[PDB]
Amino acid sequence: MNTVPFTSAPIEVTIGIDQYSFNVKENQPFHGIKDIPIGHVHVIHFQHADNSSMRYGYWFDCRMGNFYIQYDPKDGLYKMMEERDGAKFENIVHNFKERQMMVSYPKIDEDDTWYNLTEFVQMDKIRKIVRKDENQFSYVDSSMTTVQENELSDPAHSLNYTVINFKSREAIRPGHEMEDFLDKSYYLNTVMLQGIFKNSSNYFGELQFAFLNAMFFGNYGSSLQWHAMIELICSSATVPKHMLDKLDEILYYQIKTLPEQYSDILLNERVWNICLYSSFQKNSLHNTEKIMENKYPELL
Amino acid sequence: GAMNSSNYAELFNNDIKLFVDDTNVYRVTVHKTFEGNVATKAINGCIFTLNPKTGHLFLKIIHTSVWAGQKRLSQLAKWKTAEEVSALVRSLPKEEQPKQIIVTRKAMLDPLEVHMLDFPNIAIRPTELRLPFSAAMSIDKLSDVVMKATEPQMVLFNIYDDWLDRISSYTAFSRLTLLLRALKTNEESAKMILLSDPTITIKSYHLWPSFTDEQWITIESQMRDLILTEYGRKYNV
Secondary structure, eight states: OEEEEBSOOOSOEEEEETTEEEEEOTTOOOOEEEEEOTTSOEEEEEEESSOOSOOEEEEEOGGGOOEEEEEETTTTEEEEEEOOOHHHHHHHHHHHHHTTOSEEOOOOTTOOHHHHHHTTOOHHHHHHHSOOTTOSSEEEETTOOBHHHHHOOOGGGOBOOOOOOTTSGGGSOTTOHHHHHHOTHHIIIIIIIIIIISSHHHHHHHHHHHHHHHHHHOOHHHHHHHHHHHHHHHTOSOOOHHHHHHHHHHHHHHHHHSOGGGHHHHSOHHHHHIIIIISTTTTSOHHHHHHHHHHOTTTO | OOBOSTTOGGGGSSSOEEEEEOTTTSEEEEEEOTTSOEEEEEEOEEEEEEOTTTOEEEEEEEOGGGGTTOSSHHHHHHHHHHHHHHHHHHHSOGGGSOSEEEESSGGGHHHHHHHTTTOTTSEEEEBSSOOOGGGGGGSHHHHHHHHHOSSOEEEEEETTTTGGGTSOHHHHHHHHHHHHHHHHHOHHHHHHHHHSSTTSOOOTTOSSOOOOHHHHHHHHHHHHHHHHHHHHHHHTO
């Protein structure tokens, strides 16, 4: 059970830790989050009370180092930092715990939600999508654009999601135009799975990461990537049976977790209608079709 | 974006462009089977690919053999159209390749875009214009070469005959679209108007009769009359 101490909380802020969130008051004696489950990536995220613009946050894995948050009054944000001195860090956390100035990661024992959302998400893959190699943790915010968005402008601050484009030479073999456009199996299985991702676990990890960035930060490019990776599978006639079963589970937990009031901006009508009702896999996503029909029948 | 009434003169500028009409690619007769079910029998079709500035028509004849043993033919017909237009562009010298291809039907956009990925600088555009190119098969000489084809064939025409010697490509296109609109609205009447006077013939190397400038004005008047009448009937107005 790992800990992310906070130096202080000088500005009023809503703090997220994975799917949970807490309001902290200006100069409230808040000194961090304890009992963070080992074995998963986590995201700690912020929305300032005075500027509900720029949700931002940090993907991290407590197995990779000792991380803490400290407010920077110059850049005006809560920054994640690594403490390289083990004994200083242990002594900081022990003191804050003894004074009970930390919130406890509020996981219910029965509750597999976070595992279910991050099953395939690895820090090493996050750090290749979010390039800042001097840190072990990854900063994301509402405004960061994707490599794909940038092609259609500061490359250092980009989300390097795998570019998916259904009307690209990558997606379409010369001489198989109609075949490859109407059945994306070539593109899914040869180009993306065998060629780029190497396996379905890496593909799902990027899909899950894109969703979480869309949900937690309202990152529009992330939402585009999540939908494109769903659509590429649903538009393929030939998908491994384990992949379809796993996709159905992944999407079910994503749709279950999405705030009801954000379905309007986070769910693409065309993609979901095509995926559940027209696509090759219209009948392969039973759990997802059932939760979508009971939670968001308007969209459909 | 879309080609409309606003940007109509763009058709007659010096940027090579082609219209592509796929209406006549997949043609069938619907008939009863012995068992009283319904079946289709394909007939020869054609891609209508037209340079509106020069009148150069690339009539790719679609022989019924291309449909043999294929499924979802109305879908295939769009992709076959896109394949053949892509093949035509690749066959043209670079300086003859179009900068834009305008499709008369929006369903041709994705098929043509995917076939033309190798040509990212050729713009594929829809049009808001309701162009009467479906009536191409009412031009006797084009109908004849399509129906007689025993194999896939490309036939080259100038759909304006020698009109550009006397009129601009704006006026030539306006005459063509009026003639085709007439032929589309009442084929029998339109053909009657075009041939009624036996002294005005079609040259062996032409599609339309050899009208004088004055005879064209009469003809064009008679076509406008035909179109307005028909319209009053269609709508009772």
